[PDB]
Symmetry: D2
Subunit: 115 residues, 4 copies
């Protein structure tokens, strides 16, 4: 299903394990560039062709690096021969109160099972 390796549009890779309990655990790779991922997903989705909702978070700190920022992906898994996870993300960095207005970026990413 979701368990496995996913490739994003521009290079990044993640390995995720989708637990029976609805937990998402894995690693995201931008080892200097490997980071822990953690999330949740709908473990009892609809079969009417709806995708499966999920989200996950990466804090960009590891034993070598720290960008003082975090990304959260919200989106959905669509199975099939053309399996994909379509997401929108929010990147939030630590800032002072005075730069909190410019603290968050928004984007989107598509992950597929090959590439």
């Amino acid at each position: 299903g979701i368990t496995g390796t996913w490739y994003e549009q521009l290079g990044s890779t993640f390995i995720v394990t989708a637990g029976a309990d609805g937990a998402l655990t894995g690693t995201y790779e931008s080892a200097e560039s490997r980071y822990v991922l953690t999330g949740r997903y709908d473990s009892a989705p609809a079969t009417d062709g709806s995708g499966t909702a999920l989200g996950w978070t990466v804090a960009w700190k590891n034993n070598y690096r720290n960008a003082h920022s975090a990304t959260t992906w919200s989106g959905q898994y669509v199975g099939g021969a053309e399996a994909r996870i379509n997401t929108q993300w929010l990147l939030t960095s630590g800032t002072t109160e005075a730069n909190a207005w410019k603290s968050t970026l928004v984007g989107h990413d598509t992950f597929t099972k090959v590439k």
Copy 2:
């Protein structure tokens, strides 16, 4: 600092534990109880910046399932009033044709008071 009980600027409540190397665990509020999990910057800057964090809640518990998930992205702020300022994304499972309307966006502030 992050560990403890927080209240939403409307009325929800969440209980968090922050693990020494960046894990966020706890629950977002009986039938209204859901698991949350996330990560945080466990070695933030010392310049007065806040602490970047995120978490996810999938809206399924042993009683209900909305077929959707929400992620909060933000930062913890130490001050007179410690706060967590977030922006959030709620994605619902949809067929492909309705994907364009699958995701809500909003923001929220949590405080330990109230």
Copy 3:
């Protein structure tokens, strides 16, 4: 309700005229910090107590400066005592293909008449 001067929580200011077929025109703000705004709003909202949908755009260029960016605000007008415009915004900066992933900030602002 919308025509007039609005102040955002952060110090900035905008003067708008809401025309009769949904046009929004005005300036966002000394001269060096004034910029043209243009937008649209629902000139016939429901009367169920719902807010009035609107939006507008500002590119950050004037005769004196050019940040090579633009902001869009999407939100609603809520009249009455504390009349307010509640918005979410996107700021996009022109980037090369390579930095496009970090081209768009998101946030929120609330405008009041005082």
Copy 4:
């Protein structure tokens, strides 16, 4: 290269004129009035051209009590395109304001897919 007729991946069409002073005027497709701004003097460094516009979903046939704003940048190239992120807000009561806004992304090209 902004002036012209553009196509979005889901079939939507927008006709727009880019004027002298950074104004954007046109129609989104029945049809809805659009207006926006663009950077009339972009960087030389191969950066894209920042831009944005708005549509309120009311015309003479219907009104959805909503508005969408697209924020993005134009990239010339052998196949020009406009990459955008968008927010769609509906009028709602206070109690429902929390779900009043949708967020998405849209790519327009001068060729119809």
